[PDB]
């Protein structure tokens, strides 16, 4: 499923995203525009073997099980393929475990390099939240 901004955003609210670890709606937002374009289907491999998926771009390497990443842990107890759904349920339980893990939104390499200290509340402008 491809969201649009406003649906994305009421979507996130809906599970508990909102201020999150102290992370405002719209940093998840803007996490979600530049990791995936808000495409629940999005894959990326990495140069490790490992590949991301889904809206929030969540690695094999340590965060879900997809039979090809060797030595890899499954910390979000999850088949990567789960992260793909139009049902994003399971993106947002895992990333919130990423978030706690003590570099809170610096685990995502986009949110630290197009999001972080810019004017995130743009994201969810105009919405009916
Ligand atoms: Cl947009
Ligand atoms: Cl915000
Ligand atoms: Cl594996
Ligand atoms: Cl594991
Ligand atoms: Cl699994
Ligand atoms: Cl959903
Ligand atoms: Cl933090
Ligand atoms: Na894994």
Known sequence: KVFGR??????????GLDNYRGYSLGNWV???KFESNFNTQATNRNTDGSTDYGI???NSRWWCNDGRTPGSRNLCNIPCSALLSSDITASVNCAKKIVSDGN???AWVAWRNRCKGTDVQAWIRGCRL
């Open 6 to 15: 406003c649906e994305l955003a009421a979507a996130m609210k809906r599970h």
């Open 56 to 58: 929030l771009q969540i």
């Open 30 to 32: 803007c996490a979600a």
């Open 104 to 106: 809170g939104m610096n």
